[PDB]
């Protein structure tokens, strides 16, 4: 006997690692670290110089902790993960996946504790996470120095006497490597999931997904019950369309609604941002030096790449071509090439080389873009630079953008413009601020505007909605409201909050199946009797009709004796009293008390005629 | 105390369910109790979980049942989890924690009899709930909960619960029964039956496994349990597609499962479509059906019922090479693998052609040599497949001359196993002519040396082998074989024809032992006469050179320490100390530098050499402290490193307590009997006193083992070569290299560091990578790391050094290998 109830372990607002529990269903939502909070250590670099080596010495004789403008660490970036600890592993049967983001931390409650489980997502997701994490351990594994970094984890007494925003996140369990095992041994237990399938897991609670469009495969499963429209939201944009967008035809009369992925960017514009980002790309190849773009690998990107394909009609002249440096760069192109069938219904989808996603890409690869997907002797043909180069990276410390910004650190020449908002702008380039670049730091993130998850709230007419984070209140930094509007009552979410706001009291299953009886009548409940022996078999009692019921109902004196005179009684004497009738008959002297709700009759020792009452006076109500 | 500050925390805030989930967050996620006061932690923690928030108590419930597990589980906790348990039932997680609590303090460490085991197991048994509350957890309770070697009818009723998700832990808590004996009966194989038409996931996966395990208990006690499961397995296999878990699984039970009586009326009928009671595929339709992560177990069954039945090769050998065109860089592997585990009592007339082509359509760096082991090791019917594998092999051998050993070892193996099938091949291969005798190939040629390998380990059991022979060919066996023996074998051709090094250290050793009271000169001179001894007897002998390097270099040490001890400075004047007076000051680094490769580059060391060796680096450390004295003005920082130095000494003589009453006059017995003096006067007759006790203290004798070195190789990996100026730029990195094997490295994981040395002052040390180091050769491996390099344009290709170190616990470096120069590479 239990209920839903979140049990979130995490307090970040992009993504989440909510737990949606049920009675006899144990789902989980999907799970995630941190990903942007390996930064304040030294970046993984290959062929290190001589200018990130020699630094500032630490402070109280540490040797471990080197300092040059900020606090950094030289040892493994140490990767987060939640604490997951005051729920067992061993009571889980599956795991939820949203847009290709949250399986970076899922290799690690694959084969550590529990979870052995089955596992449900889509193909695209899947691979461009595979892609990822493939991506990211190869940017780990180059020149794997060792940890020297596990001695200011404990003794938390003196972790507050450093500078702020060092001591501001605790350290619980971080695991800081993939050993390359993990990762490709838990990939083995995908089974293929398509949209609004009915894979009916655990024979009682059914799964749908929705089907979002942010990007290729934004999802939102909708697990549910017999009677439950508990509804998970990952990611989902109502502007760009093309990758199959957001349909509200199924989450009308939804239950929680637990709302995950946000924009945090309610300034700015996506058509200004990327006119003033064509604008700052003109100006810095019109004159200086190359262009630096640090981005993530496939996915968000296309967009920008589409952009800057379109932009080719304006000042911007020719031999400007286009660098992508990621070890799996090829795959995902051939990737982006396969998965056609996930986009729009008839606007991108026109399968007539026209799926204006992947298809524009390779359109103009025959006149101006060389791939070459790696970086170990493939520019030997041509270098001078007059181009723009990508490089993937799952943050600031791991891609091979850090060997390029030690390469031209030169100002005034190149470009540090971003393309992910997960960052922050003193902490980002804590390590590069001795430079005097312009730092344009131009967010590119299309996540559910306040704009329009207001508007979403009014057409759902929603009840009992969860809200992620504390972010109740207004941000900092910012002079406005922006929050949601509840009816009843604003939830709230922490770091080990189990708040319960849920009650499935069994509804309404009763396993119909081959229910064939009798029908009584009366006002508006037509009342009848029911059978035993169920025999339950997987979640349902199919109670079938094959191999006691409480009495309820006044009976009328008046009905009584006709009845009796009728059937074939005769010398029968009845009286009134204050409220009730007493009766009597002169065979075995049968006296018979009928008040309001109530009923008594006795008799001397006879049986066939006891029965034979018994009987008569019970045909005269209706069986519960 | 650790109960204490618990309890404070608890009762300072006492908020509904932030302070007790914060609390109880950090202790679980901080440090193990490790002391005897875990009882006192686990009674305060138990004391407040009858309250409410049910989720703070059971998580406080999962932070004592980790916390007992560090030998704490004693029988007071288990009494009171017992009787907490028994009243705890109110929540459904609860039960569940309460239950792997009592695992955790019952399970992990009694493991006994007398209410250890058996106790707990009936509490839990008659702990049943309605609805999916403590059932899958009270199974695993049981199943790791053994009574005695006779409780399976609870499971046997129970095998027909309502949630299918259950029946899962029945199975899991039946095996754990059955790895631990128990006799199970064979009655559940019946049972066994209703498991294998579930209409579910994850439970015919495991049902395949049972039907195998009740199968390959006992195949008695009923046909007879002879090829009759079998069926059932492959059946269940038979679906492959419609789950990719549940037929690996399969393939990997029937794997073991073939080790029955396998009647061939039930195991000849399976490798076609159409049956021959087995009515059935699985054989010929599980290859091509889905994923090769089936097919891989499928093949591992099929060669582990290959290796154990010497039948059913014939009919499955083509099956196994027709297997090859997959385009899958794991199914070639392993098919080479099976076939080469399959490799006896076989026959290859025509399949060889699908079976060889895999080396040309990629590289396959390291399929090439199994290919080439397999190849070497099966047997050939007719010549002609022979001189397809020898016209592939020189095609091989043309066009990747780089695995030349390869090569000339599997054409051995060939020539070896089936002689005569080359006979009728001798005057096909070479070119010789009736009446000519012209046309002589080259010598040095890579592509007759093998052919003429073949010919000559094939001319073993040979009759008449020379009776074909050309003029050169007698000249060249002449030649080959006198200067190889291990490719070229011995022969019976009419033209051609037919422990002192031990000792001799003992009396080394002994004669620099005993002969020790003489002139300082004569010993020096002595000294250095038995260094250049042991130094060629090293480079001479090859399985006596480890130790005779160790006591080279430790006659070294004492030489450098003699010659300081006899240096100018004490003859002359103290306090002066102008400059190059004291050889010492540069021979103690040397001295401690040779103690640290003597100790760490060494592997098979004793306790004894540890401790000279240490003594050995305490006489060096006051050397080095005598000589800073000497001309050391400050008298303040003489207390300190004489303090330090005292400081050395203490630590040990703590760390090193036994074998002390065993070395007699020694440096460090004097020191230690002396040091409760010297710890009350000023550091400048100190110092003094452990000078002129230095002096003539004592010459400790080392005692010799079986020690190797620890050297590396100069393979061809970018090694020493013409200047070959690769293209690069100056931007990014330049190129990659592959570095060179090692040899006796005492596990070189996380222990061998790879040096660059640029011609500019800076130096890079890229750490080594675990993933790459191959250790098929135990006593020998090899380190194929990818090297990044990159700097600045150079204008010229001048040089560029790459080397290859060793890692200390806070940090030093041993050069190990000769100094090998890398490619030019001018960017």
């Given at each position: 006997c239990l209920s839903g109830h979140p049990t979130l372990p995490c307090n970040v607002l992009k993504f989440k690692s909510t737990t949606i529990m049920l009675?006899?269903?144990?789902d989980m939502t999907s799970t995630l670290n941190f990903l942007?909070?390996?930064?304040?250590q030294s970046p993984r670099l290959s062929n290190l110089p001589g200018w990130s080596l020699k630094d500032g010495n630490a402070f109280?004789?540490?040797?471990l902790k080197e300092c040059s403008g900020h606090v950094f660490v030289?040892?493994?970036?140490e990767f987060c993960l939640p604490?997951?600890?005051?729920?067992?592993?061993?009571?889980?049967?599956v795991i939820l996946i949203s847009n290709?983001?949250?399986?970076?931390?899922?290799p690690y409650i694959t084969e550590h504790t529990g979870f052995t489980g089955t596992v449900y997502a889509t193909e695209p997701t899947v691979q461009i996470g595979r892609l990822l994490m493939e991506e990211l351990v190869n940017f780990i594994e180059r020149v794997p120095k060792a940890q020297?970094?596990?001695?200011?984890?404990?003794?938390?007494?003196?972790?507050?006497?450093?500078?702020?925003?060092?001591?501001a996140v605790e350290v619980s369990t971080?695991?800081?490597?993939?050993?390359?095992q993990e990762v490709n041994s838990a990939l083995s237990k995908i089974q293929l999931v398509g949209y609004?399938?009915?894979?009916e897991l655990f024979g009682a609670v059914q799964v749908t997904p929705l089907?979002?469009?942010?990007?290729?495969?934004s999802s939102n499963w909708i697990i549910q019950s017999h009677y439950e429209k508990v509804s998970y939201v990952s990611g989902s944009s109502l502007?760009?369309?093309?990758?199959?967008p957001m349909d509200?035809?199924?989450?009308?009369?939804?239950?929680?609604?637990?709302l995950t992925g946000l924009?945090?960017?309610?300034?700015?514009?996506p058509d200004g941002m990327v006119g003033e980002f064509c604008s700052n790309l003109a100006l810095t190849v019109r004159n200086g030096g190359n262009v630096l773009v640090p981005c993530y690998p496939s996915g968000v990107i296309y967009d920008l790449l589409e952009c800057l394909y379109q932009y080719i009609?304006?000042?911007?002249?020719?031999?400007?071509p286009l660098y992508f440096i990621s070890p799996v760069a090829n795959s995902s192109l051939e990737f982006s090439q396969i998965f056609?069938?996930?986009?729009?219904?008839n606007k991108q989808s026109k399968?007539?080389?026209?799926?204006?996603?992947?298809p524009h890409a390779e359109l103009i690869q025959t006149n101006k873009l060389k791939?070459?997907?790696?970086?170990?002797?493939?520019?030997?043909?041509?270098?001078?630079?007059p181009c723009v180069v990508f490089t993937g990276h799952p943050?600031?410390?791991?891609?091979?953008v850090v060997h390029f910004m030690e390469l031209?650190?030169?100002?005034?020449?190149?470009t540090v413009i971003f393309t992910e908002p997960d960052f922050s702008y003193l902490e980002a380039l804590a390590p590069y601020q001795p430079l005097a670049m312009?730092?344009?730091?131009?967010?590119i993130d299309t996540r559910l505007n306040f704009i329009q998850v207001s508007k979403l709230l009014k057409e759902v007419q929603p009840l009992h909605v969860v809200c992620?984070?504390?972010?109740?209140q207004p941000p900092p930094a910012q002079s406005h409201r922006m929050d949601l509007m509840i009816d009843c009552q604003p939830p709230a979410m922490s770091y080990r909050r189990a708040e319960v706001l849920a009650?499935?009291?069994?509804?309404?299953?009763?396993?119909?199946?081959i229910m064939p009886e009798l029908a009584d009548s009366l006002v508006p409940m037509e009342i009848k009797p029911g059978i035993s022996?169920?025999?339950?078999?997987?979640?349902?009692?199919?109670?079938?009709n094959k191999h006691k019921p409480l009495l309820s109902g006044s009976i009328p004196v008046e009905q009584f004796v006709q009845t009796l005179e009728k059937h074939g009684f005769s010398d029968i004497k009845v009286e009134d009293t204050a409220k009730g009738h007493i009766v009597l008959l002169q065979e075995a002297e049968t006296l018979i008390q009928i008040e309001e709700d109530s009923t008594h009759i006795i008799c001397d020792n006879d049986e066939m005629l006891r029965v034979r009452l018994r009987d008569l006076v019970l045909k005269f109500l209706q069986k519960f | 105390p650790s109960k204490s500050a618990a309890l404070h925390i608890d009762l300072?805030?006492?908020?509904?369910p932030a302070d007790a989930l914060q609390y109880l967050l950090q202790f679980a996620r901080k440090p193990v109790?490790?002391?005897?006061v875990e009882g006192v932690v686990r009674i305060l923690l138990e004391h407040y979980?009858?309250?409410?928030?049910p989720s703070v108590r059971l998580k406080i419930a999962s932070l004592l049942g980790l916390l007992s597990k560090?030998?704490?589980?004693?029988p007071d906790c288990i009494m009171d989890d017992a009787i907490n348990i028994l009243q705890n039932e109110k929540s459904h997680q609860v039960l569940a924690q309460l239950l792997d609590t009592l695992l955790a303090i019952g399970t992990k460490?009694?493991?006994?009899?007398a209410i250890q085991m058996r106790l707990v197991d009936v509490a839990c048994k008659h702990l049943?709930?309605?609805?999916?509350?403590?059932r899958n957890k009270c199974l695993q309770l049981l199943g790791n909960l053994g009574s005695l070697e006779k409780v399976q009818k609870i499971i046997g009723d129970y095998?027909?619960?309502?949630?299918?998700?259950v029946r899962t832990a029945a199975i899991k808590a039946m095996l754990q029964l059955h790895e631990r004996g128990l006799?199970?009966?064979?009655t559940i194989y019946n049972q066994a039956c209703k498991l294998?038409?579930?209409?579910?996931?994850?439970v015919r996966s495991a049902a395949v496994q049972l039907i195998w395990v009740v199968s390959q208990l006992?195949?008695?006690?009923?046909?007879?349990s002879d090829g009759s499961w079998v069926v059932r397995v492959q059946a269940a296999k038979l679906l492959g597609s419609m789950e990719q878990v549940s037929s690996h699984f399969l393939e990997q039970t029937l794997d073991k499962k073939?080790?029955?009586?396998?009647?061939r009326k039930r195991t000849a009928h399976e490798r076609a479509k159409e049956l021959y009671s087995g009515a059935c595929?699985?054989?010929?339709?599980?290859?091509?059906?889905?994923?090769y992560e089936v097919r891989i177990a499928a093949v591992e069954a099929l060669c582990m019922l290959a290796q154990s039945s010497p039948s059913f090769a014939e009919k499955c050998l083509d099956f196994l090479v027709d297997?090859?065109?997959?385009?899958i860089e794991e199914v070639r592997l392993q098919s080479i693998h099976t076939m080469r585990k399959i490799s006896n009592n076989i026959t290859l007339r025509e399949d060889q052609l699908d079976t060889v082509l895999?080396?040309?359509?990629?590289?396959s760096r390291d399929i090439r040599e199994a290919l080439h082991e397999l190849l070497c090791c099966t047997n050939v019917s007719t010549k002609e497949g022979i001189h397809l594998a020898l016209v592939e092999l020189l095609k091989n051998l043309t066009k990747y001359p780089t695995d030349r050993d390869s090569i000339w070892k599997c054409l051995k193996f060939l020539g070896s196993r089936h002689?005569?099938?080359?006979l009728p091949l001798v005057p096909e291969l070479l070119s010789t002519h009736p009446f000519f005798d012209t046309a002589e190939p080259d010598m040095d040629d890579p592509a007759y040396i093998a052919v003429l390998v073949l010919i000559f380990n094939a001319?073993?059991?040979?009759?008449?082998?020379?009776?074909?022979?050309?003029?050169?060919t007698f000249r060249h066996y002449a030649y080959l074989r006198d200067s190889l023996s291990h490719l070229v074998p011995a022969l019976r051709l009419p033209g051609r024809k037919l422990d002192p090094s031990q000792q001799f250290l003992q009396q080394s050793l002994e004669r620099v032992y005993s002969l020790q009271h003489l002139d300082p000169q004569g010993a020096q001179e002595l000294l250095e006469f038995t260094i250049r001894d042991l130094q060629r007897l090293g480079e001479l002998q090859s399985e006596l050179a480890g130790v005779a390097d160790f006591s080279a270099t430790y006659l070294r040490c004492q030489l450098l320490l003699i010659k300081a001890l006899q240096e100018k400075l004490w003859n002359?004047?103290?306090?002066?100390?102008?400059?190059?007076?004291?050889?010492?000051?540069?021979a103690a680094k040397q001295i401690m530098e040779e103690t640290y490769k003597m100790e760490f580059?060494?592997?098979?060391?004793?306790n004894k050499q540890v401790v000279i060796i240490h003594h050995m680096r305490l006489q060096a450390k006051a050397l080095q402290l005598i000589v800073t004295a000497r001309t050391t003005?400050?008298?303040?920082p003489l207390f300190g490193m004489c303090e330090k130095f005292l400081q050395e000494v203490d630590f040990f003589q703590r760390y090193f307590i036994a074998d002390l009453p065993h070395l007699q006059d020694s440096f460090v017995d004097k020191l230690l009997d002396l040091m409760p003096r010297l710890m009350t006067s000023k550091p400048a007759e100190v110092v003094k006193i452990l000078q002129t006790m230095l002096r003539q203290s004592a010459f400790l004798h080392l005692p010799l083992p079986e020690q190797i070195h620890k050297a590396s190789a100069t393979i061809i990996?970018?090694?020493?070569?013409?200047?070959?100026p690769l293209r690069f730029t100056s931007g990014l990195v330049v190129a990659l290299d592959v570095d060179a094997t090692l040899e006796h490295?005492?596990?070189?994981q996380n222990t061998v560091k790879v040096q660059v040395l640029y011609p500019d002052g800076q130096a890079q040390m890229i750490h080594p990578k675990?993933?790459?180091?191959?250790?098929?050769g135990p006593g020998r491996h090899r380190l194929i790391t990818q090297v990044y390099l990159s700097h600045t344009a150079?204008?010229?290709?001048c040089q560029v050094e790459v080397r290859l170190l060793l890692a200390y616990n806070s940090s030093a470096r041993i050069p190990k290998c000769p100094w090998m120069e890398g490619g030019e590479m001018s960017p």
């Open positions: 009675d006899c269903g144990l942007p909070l390996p930064l304040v109280l004789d540490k040797e030289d040892s493994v970036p604490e997951t600890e005051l729920i067992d592993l061993s009571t889980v049967d290709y983001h949250c399986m970076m931390a899922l020297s970094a596990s001695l200011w984890k404990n003794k938390d007494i003196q972790r507050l006497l450093p500078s702020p925003l060092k001591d971080w695991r800081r490597c993939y050993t390359m609004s399938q009915k894979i089907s979002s469009g942010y990007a290729l495969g502007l760009t369309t093309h990758p199959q509200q035809a199924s989450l009308k009369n939804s239950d929680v609604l637990v924009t945090q960017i309610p300034t700015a514009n009609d304006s000042a911007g002249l020719s031999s400007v056609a069938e996930w986009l729009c219904h399968v007539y080389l026209p799926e204006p996603p992947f791939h070459y997907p790696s970086i170990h002797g493939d520019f030997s043909n041509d270098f001078r630079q943050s600031l410390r791991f891609g091979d031209w650190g030169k100002s005034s020449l190149n312009k730092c344009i730091y131009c967010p992620p984070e504390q972010y109740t009650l499935p009291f069994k509804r309404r299953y009763e396993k119909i199946e022996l169920a025999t339950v078999s997987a979640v349902l009692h199919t109670k079938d | 300072c805030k006492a908020t509904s109790e490790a002391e005897s979980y009858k309250e409410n928030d560090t030998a704490g589980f004693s460490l009694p493991e006994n009899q049943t709930d309605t609805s999916h509350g403590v095998f027909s619960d309502q949630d299918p998700r006799k199970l009966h064979q294998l038409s579930d209409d579910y996931e994850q006992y195949p008695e006690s009923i046909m007879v073939l080790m029955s009586d396998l009647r595929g699985a054989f010929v339709h599980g290859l091509e059906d889905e994923m297997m090859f065109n997959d385009e895999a080396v040309l359509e990629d590289s002689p005569t099938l080359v001319a073993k059991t040979c009759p008449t082998m020379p009776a074909l022979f050309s003029d050169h002359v004047a103290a306090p002066l100390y102008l400059k190059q007076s004291d050889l010492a000051s540069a580059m060494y592997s098979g060391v004793e003005r400050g008298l303040d990996e970018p090694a020493g070569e013409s200047d070959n490295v005492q596990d070189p675990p993933a790459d180091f191959r250790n098929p150079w204008t010229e290709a």
